[PDB]
């Protein structure tokens with residue numbers, strides 16, 4: 562749909578059988594989720610943001626449903642304060658920025 | 661303009677007589693820019709990111725031109741690694757998210 566930016570653009574996602582809300586985030590290259598239970602194997606990474614770097618786990622080929630749309634991609638799970646959906650999956654759902 | 665998200669959504673801004681590039685960042689409530697010289701009054705502030713917190717200076721009523729659109733608002737200046745335009749200015753230029 563179209564979403565204006567007067568409030569945070571949150572969406573519901575379903576991931577790993579669980580329902581969460583996430584922020585649509587054009588500044589983020591990748592998707593980063595708060596720590597959660599996910600099968601099964603993963604690789605450690607660092608990411609940097611404002612504030613500094615964090616260490617995260619990388620899971621590839623995870624299925625996520627963002628609104629009704631399915632996508633498969635990498636997710637990073639880790640100590641984020643907020644679930645962020647970045648450009649790796651925003652492109653899959655066809656999201657654009659328009660002004 | 662419409663921007664797809666296959667690459668980072670960067671724009672040119674003019675602020676304070678200087679020309680910069682900045683990310684359009686729907687996840688950011690506010691705008692924060694790397695250290696640069698602005699004239700005038702500011703207040704200290706601290707913002708939290710992935711990774712932690714930074715201390716930043718808040719300047720109010722700063723004119724920015726983003727693409728060919730002028731906006732006025734608060735900018736936070738500080739040690740961010742990248743300049744981000746957040747929703748406080750994104751609403752002023754009429755930016756929407758569309759999927």
Ligand SMILES: O=C1N(Cc2ccc(CO)cc2)[C@H](Cc2ccccc2)[C@H](O)[C@@H](O)[C@@H](Cc2ccccc2)N1Cc1ccc(CO)cc1
Nearest residue numbers: 588589590591609610611643687688689690708709710741
């Ligand atoms: O750290 C932030 N990252 C860091 C980040 C890095 C990597 C990924 C995955 O690849 C995801 C997020 C982004 C901005 C940024 C990108 C690259 C380098 C430096 C900064 C993000 O794009 C922005 O949306 C918020 C996301 C966010 C929002 C709330 C709480 C935590 C995280 N932030 C922090 C931020 C907070 C406040 C303001 C001003 O109000 C601006 C930014």
